[PDB]
Amino acid sequence: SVPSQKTYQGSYGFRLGFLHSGTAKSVTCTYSPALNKLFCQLAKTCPVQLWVDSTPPPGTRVRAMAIYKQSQHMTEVVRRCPHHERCSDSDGLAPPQHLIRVEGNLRAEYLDDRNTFRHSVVVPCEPPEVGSDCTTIHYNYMCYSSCMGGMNRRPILTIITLEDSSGNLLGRDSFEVRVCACPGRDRRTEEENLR
Numbered sequence: 001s002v003p004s005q006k007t008y009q010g011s012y013g014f015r016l017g018f019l020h021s022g023t024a025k026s027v028t029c030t031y032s033p034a035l036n037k038l039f040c041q042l043a044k045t046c047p048v049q050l051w052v053d054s055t056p057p058p059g060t061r062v063r064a065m066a067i068y069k070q071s072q073h074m075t076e077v078v079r080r081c082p083h084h085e086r087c088s089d090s091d092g093l094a095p096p097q098h099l100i101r102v103e104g105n106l107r108a109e110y111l112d113d114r115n116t117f118r119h120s121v122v123v124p125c126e127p128p129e130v131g132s133d134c135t136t137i138h139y140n141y142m143c144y145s146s147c148m149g150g151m152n153r154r155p156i157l158t159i160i161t162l163e164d165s166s167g168n169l170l171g172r173d174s175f176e177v178r179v180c181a182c183p184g185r186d187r188r189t190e191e192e193n194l195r
């Protein structure tokens with residue numbers, strides 16, 4: 001009834017990477033290693049790097065899923081709020097209820113789990129472009145952390161899993177997410193609070 005969040009590199013040495021975008025007021029997406037937390041604006045591009053030590057097999061996929069970070073909310077499905085699920089902003093592929101979208105990948109598949117009712121989005125794992133050392137997936141988060149009737153100011157985690165063609169686990173990584181109007185300011189504030 002709750003997805004595992006345990007970091008697991010597995011046989012291929014799977015882990016995530018993030019750009020260094022800084023904390024200027026104008027920044028739209030920024031990652032805090034000290035907090036393991038991504039701060040981003042609504043529906044803006046969030047580049048996430050996929051690193052392995054060796055190439056996994058053809059048919060390997062990469063899934064993203066959100067869960068609530070607090071234990072007392074973790075069995076609740078993370079979904080878009082009653083406003084945003086009705087604002088008709090679909091890309092023609094993502095169901096309007098899904099918080100997490102993949103941008104610019106026509107092979108993205110969106111799952112509503114028949115047993116758990118959780119949402120996820122999965123894409124084929126592709127090797128890096130010639131000249132690149134990793135593959136980047138572009139995610140969008142489609143509600144604010146503060147949306148009433150949705151996340152309702154509750155923190156979430158994104159869990160990224162590397163899966164074989166059957167959906168079996170090959171690797172797992174995760175990060176906290178705050179979707180907010182001013183990611184740069186909020187990252188600076190939370191990093192200072194931590195210090």
Ligand SMILES: CCc1cccc2c(C3CCNCC3)c[nH]c12
Pocket residue numbers: 050051052053054055056125126127128133134135
């Ligand atoms: C997970 C995405 C992905 C698929 C296949 C290969 C890679 C690499 C490296 C692995 C070591 N040799 C160069 C590509 C980073 N990321 C990958």
Ligand SMILES: [Zn+2]
Pocket residue numbers: 080081082083084085142143144147148150
């Ligand atoms: Zn919302």
